[PDB]
Amino acid sequence: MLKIIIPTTMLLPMTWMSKHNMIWINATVHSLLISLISLSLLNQLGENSLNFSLTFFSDSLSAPLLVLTTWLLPLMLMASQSHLSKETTTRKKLYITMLILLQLFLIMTFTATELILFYILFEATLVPTLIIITRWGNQTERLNAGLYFLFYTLAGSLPLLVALVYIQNTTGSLNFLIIHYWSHPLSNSWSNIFMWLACIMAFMVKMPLYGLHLWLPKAHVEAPIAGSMVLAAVLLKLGGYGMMRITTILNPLTNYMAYPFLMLSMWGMIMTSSICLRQTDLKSLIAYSSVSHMALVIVAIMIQTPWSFMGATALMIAHGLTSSMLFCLANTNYERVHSRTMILARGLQTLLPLMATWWLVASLTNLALPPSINLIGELFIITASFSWSNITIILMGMNMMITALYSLYMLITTQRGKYTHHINNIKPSFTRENALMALHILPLLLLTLNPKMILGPLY
Amino acid sequence: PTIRLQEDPDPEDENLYEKNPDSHGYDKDPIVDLWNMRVVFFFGFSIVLVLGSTFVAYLPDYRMQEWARREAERLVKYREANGLPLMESNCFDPNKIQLPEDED
Amino acid sequence: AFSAPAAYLTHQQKVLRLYKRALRHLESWCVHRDKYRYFACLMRARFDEHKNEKDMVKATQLLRQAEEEFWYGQHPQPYIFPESPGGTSYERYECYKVPEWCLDDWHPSEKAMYPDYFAKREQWKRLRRESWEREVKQLQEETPPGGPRTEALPPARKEGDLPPLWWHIVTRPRERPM
Amino acid sequence: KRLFIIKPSGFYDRRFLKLMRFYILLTGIPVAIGITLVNVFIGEAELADIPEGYVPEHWEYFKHPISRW
Amino acid sequence: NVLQIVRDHWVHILVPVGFVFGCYLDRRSDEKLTAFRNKSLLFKRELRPNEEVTWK
Amino acid sequence: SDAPPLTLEAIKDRVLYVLKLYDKIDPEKLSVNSHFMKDLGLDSLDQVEIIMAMEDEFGFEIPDIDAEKLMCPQEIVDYIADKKDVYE
Ligand SMILES: CCCCCCCCCCCCCCCCCC(=O)OC[C@H](COP(=O)([O-])OCC(O)COP(=O)([O-])OC[C@@H](COC(=O)CCCCCCCCCCCCCCCCC)OC(=O)CCCCCCCCCCCCCCCCC)OC(=O)CCCCCCCCCCCCCCCCC
Ligand SMILES: CCCCCCCCCCCCCCCCC[C@@H](O)O[C@H](CO[C@H](O)CCCCCCCCCCCCCCC)COP(=O)(O)OCC[N+](C)(C)C
Ligand SMILES: CCCCCCCCCCCCCCCCC[C@@H](O)O[C@H](CO[C@H](O)CCCCCCCCCCCCCCC)COP(=O)(O)OCC[N+](C)(C)C
Ligand SMILES: CCCCCCCC/C=C\CCCCCCCC(=O)O[C@H](COC(=O)CCCCCCC/C=C/CCCCCCCC)COP(=O)(O)OCCN
Numbered sequence: 033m034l035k036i037i038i039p040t041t042m043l044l045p046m047t048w049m050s051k052h053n054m055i056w057i058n059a060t061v062h063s064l065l066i067s068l069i070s071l072s073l074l075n076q077l078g079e080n081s082l083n084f085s086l087t088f089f090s091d092s093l094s095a096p097l098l099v100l101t102t103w104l105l106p107l108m109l110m111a112s113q114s115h116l117s118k119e120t121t122t123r124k125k126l127y128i129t130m131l132i133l134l135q136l137f138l139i140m141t142f143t144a145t146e147l148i149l150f151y152i153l154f155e156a157t158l159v160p161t162l163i164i165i166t167r168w169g170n171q172t173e174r175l176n177a178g179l180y181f182l183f184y185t186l187a188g189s190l191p192l193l194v195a196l197v198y199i200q201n202t203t204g205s206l207n208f209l210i211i212h213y214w215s216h217p218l219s220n221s222w223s224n225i226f227m228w229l230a231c232i233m234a235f236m237v238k239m240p241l242y243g244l245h246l247w248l249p250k251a252h253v254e255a256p257i258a259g260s261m262v263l264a265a266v267l268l269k270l271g272g273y274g275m276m277r278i279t280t281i282l283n284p285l286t287n288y289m290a291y292p293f294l295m296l297s298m299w300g301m302i303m304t305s306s307i308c309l310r311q312t313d314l315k316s317l318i319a320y321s322s323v324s325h326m327a328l329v330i331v332a333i334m335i336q337t338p339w340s341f342m343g344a345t346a347l348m349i350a351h352g353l354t355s356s357m358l359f360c361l362a363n364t365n366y367e368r369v370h371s372r373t374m375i376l377a378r379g380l381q382t383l384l385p386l387m388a389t390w391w392l393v394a395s396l397t398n399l400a401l402p403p404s405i406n407l408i409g410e411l412f413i414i415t416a417s418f419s420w421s422n423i424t425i426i427l428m429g430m431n432m433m434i435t436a437l438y439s440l441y442m443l444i445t446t447q448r449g450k451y452t453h454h455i456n457n458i459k460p461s462f463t464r465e466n467a468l469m470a471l472h473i474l475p476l477l478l479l480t481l482n483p484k485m486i487l488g489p490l491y
Numbered sequence: 492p493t494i495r496l497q498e499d500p501d502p503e504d505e506n507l508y509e510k511n512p513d514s515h516g517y518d519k520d521p522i523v524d525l526w527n528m529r530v531v532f533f534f535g536f537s538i539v540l541v542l543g544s545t546f547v548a549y550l551p552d553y554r555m556q557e558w559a560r561r562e563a564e565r566l567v568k569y570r571e572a573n574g575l576p577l578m579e580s581n582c583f584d585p586n587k588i589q590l591p592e593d594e595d
Numbered sequence: 596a597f598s599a600p601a602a603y604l605t606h607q608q609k610v611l612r613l614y615k616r617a618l619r620h621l622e623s624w625c626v627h628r629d630k631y632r633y634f635a636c637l638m639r640a641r642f643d644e645h646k647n648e649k650d651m652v653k654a655t656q657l658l659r660q661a662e663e664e665f666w667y668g669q670h671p672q673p674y675i676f677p678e679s680p681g682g683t684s685y686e687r688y689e690c691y692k693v694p695e696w697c698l699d700d701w702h703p704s705e706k707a708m709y710p711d712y713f714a715k716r717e718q719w720k721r722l723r724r725e726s727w728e729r730e731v732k733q734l735q736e737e738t739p740p741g742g743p744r745t746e747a748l749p750p751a752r753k754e755g756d757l758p759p760l761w762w763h764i765v766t767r768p769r770e771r772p773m
Numbered sequence: 774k775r776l777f778i779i780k781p782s783g784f785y786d787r788r789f790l791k792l793m794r795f796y797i798l799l800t801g802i803p804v805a806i807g808i809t810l811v812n813v814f815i816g817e818a819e820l821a822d823i824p825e826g827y828v829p830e831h832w833e834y835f836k837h838p839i840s841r842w
Numbered sequence: 843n844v845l846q847i848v849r850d851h852w853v854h855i856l857v858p859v860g861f862v863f864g865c866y867l868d869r870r871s872d873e874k875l876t877a878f879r880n881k882s883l884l885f886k887r888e889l890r891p892n893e894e895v896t897w898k
Numbered sequence: 899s900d901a902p903p904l905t906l907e908a909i910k911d912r913v914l915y916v917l918k919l920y921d922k923i924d925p926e927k928l929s930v931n932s933h934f935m936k937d938l939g940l941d942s943l944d945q946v947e948i949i950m951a952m953e954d955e956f957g958f959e960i961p962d963i964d965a966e967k968l969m970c971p972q973e974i975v976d977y978i979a980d981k982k983d984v985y986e
């Protein structure tokens with residue numbers, strides 16, 4: 033597994049020893065090659081994981097997450113080099129260093145065998161993200177956003193640490209293989225109830241769960257483009273991965289402790305999806321669609337069935353790709369008109385025909401058009417929820433209807449109608465932006481032909 | 492002075508097409524910009540997208556799906572000829588199980 | 596849509612608009628031309644019956660009762676001209692109207708075709724550049740200190756002058772741009 | 774008479790599309806030719822019984838030549 | 843002339859060799875987890891008359 | 899194909915044709931520059947009917963604010979030419 037880690041670490045001295053006008057080229061090429069190397073982890077077994085060493089292992093759940101993480105870095109570098117043009121050389125290298133450190137932390141987080149090491153890396157991912165948001169964000173709110181990002185997460189994860197070192201003191205180990213094999217039921221007691229809460233709330237805040245999702249519309253909106261791309265595509269999935277990993281110790285306590293979270297998720301799906309209908313900020317609309325999509329992953333993980341776990345894995349990957357593409361698409365317009373108001377620039381299909389096609393495809397994948405993997409994950413979760421209770425079809429059905437409404441609305445407001453008369457600085461699309469959209473959308477469509485690669489360990 | 496400080500005016504954004512009408516939007520320097528475009532296109536579309544997709548398509552069956560199909564065919568053939576049930580209700584043999592003493 | 600609106604409509608304007616609207620809805624009800632001619636002459640007679648009323652209270656009351664009559668008796672599906680605001684071709688060609696400033700972003704290979712068109716465009720751009728300060732000066736001098744009372748714009752009063760704020764009216768895309 | 778049609782600059786979209794097409798084909802066409810040549814001249818393996826006293830290599834458990842490689 | 847290329851393009855070999863080194867460090871790791879090599883109840887096997895280990 | 903490229907002379911011809919078909923206005927007296935009120939002694943109500951007849955002739959609707967002002971056939975021709983983008 034060091035054959036991926038060490039090349040990623042070499043991106044730092046390579047970036048710092050590069051010419052002033054060659055950092056973007058070198059970083060992009062070598063991060064793409066690291067993605068190529070990362071593709072080898074998709075060769076998974078049917079029975080157990082790829083146990084590289086005592087420290088690192090790879091499973092059918094973490095391999096697609098690793099591939100998405102490595103694939104996202106070149107796209108972030110491509111999306112960042114436009115608005116960082118006037119920046120000094122050393123600050124450009126510092127921004128690229130922040131991105132490389134984030135990738136390194138995420139790669140180790142997804143493959144750590146022991147839960148304390150996983151916790152340390154999963155918390156270390158906060159520092160580069162906060163620095164990115166609060167140093168390179170554009171507005172004065174970016175400071176407050178940073179605080180919201182910092183303290184929502186930590187207030188959730190500080191109990192988790194206390195739980196973890198507690199568990200090792202009673203079971204003897206925090207190794208995930210040992211934890212899974214030597215698993216024992218959780219009794220029905222107040223102490224076990226609070227241990228269950230300490231093991232779960234940290235991940236719930238990362239998803240985030242409706243009710244503790246306030247930090248997200250601030251952090252994603254105020255962040256720079258690469259910050260929001262990594263926040264939506266990978267950092268939200270840390271909660272899903274951690275919940276999937278930690279659920280084994282939780283049973284049979286999860287059957288009754290999951291009710292408040294299932295109610296919050298199944299209602300906040302409707303709440304945030306409807307919030308998207310009345311949103312004057314385009315980037316804020318895209319951010320809220322993420323909460324609406326992750327409510328479904330929370331439901332799938334809480335109900336604890338093989339179909340739900342498969343659906344949650346597929347939906348996490350598909351949402352990562354689609355939300356990253358949507359944030360980039362909004363940034364293309366922002367770098368033209370310098371405002372995130374959705375109705376400021378209209379009728380753009382007339383002026384930018386191919387970027388309109390990109391918008392249409394992104395909106396189609398957002399509303400889970402078959403046979404996209406967005407739809408595969410959504411439908412698997414809906415089927416498992418129907419098994420859990422038939423009445424769920426009403427809530428699930430309603431969410432689907434609303435999701436299509438605010439997606440196409442987002443399409444109709446920005447692309448159709450007539451272009452505003454005063455704006456006259458709308459330049460033709462650059463090759464960089466078009467390629468950035470294509471490198472988002474082509475892997476998404478290609479994953480339809482081999483969905484077993486993104487369906488997790490329950491396939 | 493009714494201004495609170497000495498400050499630069501906010502500068503207007505630069506159009507890359509003014510000096511490089513075929514600008515690709517990667518860099519101000521035309522040569523560096525063109526090589527950024529070529530390197531992104533080659534290493535993203537030609538290498539990772541095509542060769543990576545081909546590599547993933549032809550991955551060996553380490554998930555043992557064809558193996559499981561073959562084993563299932565073997566046991567279905569064997570059981571049907573024998574007249575034994577196609578599938579067994581209990582995965583683990585009863586003889587090796589020691590239930591508690593009595594039902595009460 | 597070309598004339599500036601006024602602060603209000605006078606009584607004469609209101610009754611004329613009512614006459615036109617009632618005639619159009621009557622034509623919607625009376626499909627055939629002879630029947631429309633008959634009842635339109637009856638409508639004109641009904642309007643002429645009080646043509647020279649001098650009691651403005653009585654005239655206003657009569658106009659109000661006429662409005663109440665029309666609203667009850669209006670056709671729920673009035674005929675609309677195809678390109679009128681309610682018609683079936685109202686904004687059909689707006690997707691084809693492209694602003695002329697887009698031509699500035701054409702690649703030089705695109706501009707290599709149509710050399711005469713772009714030479715004429717350069718002359719038009721020079722004309723627009725050269726007369727802007729005179730138009731601004733004219734507007735400032737003509738308008739009152741408080742500000743302009745109405746949206747009416749003045750014509751060019753000197754010889755080599757263009758009417759102020761003319762570029763976007765003149766360079767309208769087209770009604771059938773493609 | 775023929776009139777001028779005011780359009781946004783279509784040069785850059787067309788250039789991007791032909792660049793993407795070329796850079797995809799540059800490797801895709803050789804890959805397709807290689808795959809079909811391998812298929813035609815080096816077919817899939819044939820399922821056989823393991824000869825007595827022979828331990829197959831791990832790659833000898835797959836039937837497609839590319840997967841075996 | 844070799845310096846005009848090498849002195850400004852050597853940063854292009856950091857990640858490749860960093861990959862190669864990484865692979866090496868994996869193999870050495872595999873040499874510390876051989877306590878059950880050819881000892882599992884599922885894959886225990888008589889060695890071929892020339893081979894020394896079932897895997898490296 | 900579609901409708902021919904309608905020209906200025908055609909607009910003038912159709913406007914004068916419609917006016918000459920109006921019983922209130924005699925054909926010999928009517929001129930392109932004739933005012934509908936001073937020259938023809940026509941009331942405001944009468945004027946509205948002419949505008950509606952022009953709408954029916956050319957198949958498009960003239961807004962009331964725009965319509966009231968048109969007092970000469972030349973004015974109507976110029977308005978129609980401006981709407982249809984007629985330059986000869
Ligand atoms: C354009 C830019 C925009 C980009 C768009 C976005 C894309 C982004 C980039 C993505 C990169 C792609 C990566 C994917 C790689 C995956 C490749 C792969 O896995 O290959 C699998 C597959 C090969 O499977 P395999 O496991 O390798 O072979 C197994 C056997 O052992 C082998 O069987 P065999 O040994 O018995 O013989 C088979 C052999 C031999 O074939 C033959 O010779 C037999 C032909 C019989 C013809 C019979 C008459 C002809 C001759 C008669 C006359 C001669 C004699 C008489 C002379 C006198 C004349 C009268 O042929 C082959 O091996 C097939 C060649 C494979 C080509 C694969 C194409 C993808 C390459 C990857 C790169 C693509 C990049 C684009 C560039 C593409 C360049 C082309 O490739 C296929 O394409 C199979 C498709 C066959 C299906 C037929 C159609 C079925 C219709 C059902 C659907 C109907 C519903 C409506 C929907 C219709 C929509 C179409
Ligand atoms: C906005 C987003 C916030 C995040 C949402 C987190 C939700 C956390 C909710 C925790 C789920 C359940 C907690 C404990 C399980 C039962 C709680 C209680 O209501 O049920 C009865 C509990 O009995 C009594 O009701 C005691 C609880 C009453 C005192 C607690 C106050 C709860 C009020 C709600 C506070 C708001 C929670 C969030 C704070 C910010 C069960 O009856 P009983 O048979 O006797 O007890 C069996 C439990 N045993 C086995 C451990 C013994
Ligand atoms: C511009 C104009 C557009 C229209 C014109 C284009 C012309 C048509 C071209 C489009 C082709 C249509 C596709 C038709 C389907 C045929 C392809 C199919 O056969 O290949 C699949 C194979 O597809 C691959 O399995 C999926 C590729 C995996 C995608 C990975 C993306 C690369 C990595 C990028 C990083 C992104 C991060 C992802 C996070 C997880 C079949 O899978 P499989 O049933 O097995 O094959 C059986 C035989 N085998 C097993 C021996 C090989
Ligand atoms: C962004 C906001 C997120 C908020 C997350 C905070 C909630 C975390 C859940 C509680 C955290 C503390 C739990 C302690 C760790 C559990 C380990 C454990 O098992 O210890 C228990 C002890 O459990 C406790 O003592 C916990 C009691 C609570 C102490 C601190 C109170 C915190 C507030 C409680 C309610 C809030 C929790 C839900 C709020 C959700 C977020 C709004 C039993 O051990 P023993 O003593 O050995 O018993 C067996 C032998 N006698």
Ligand SMILES: CCCCCCCCCCCC(=O)SCCNC(=O)CCNC(=O)[C@H](O)C(C)(C)COP(=O)(O)O
Pocket residue numbers: 606607610611617618620621624641642645646647648653654655656657658660661662664665668669670941942943944
């Ligand atoms: C299907 C249709 C539904 C039915 C609609 C019902 C409508 C009511 C029918 C009867 C109409 C009335 O009451 S009529 C309105 C009642 N009041 C008056 O008429 C006041 C006097 N009007 C004038 O003095 C003006 O000069 C003027 C007459 C406008 C001419 O102006 P010109 O000559 O200077 O253009």
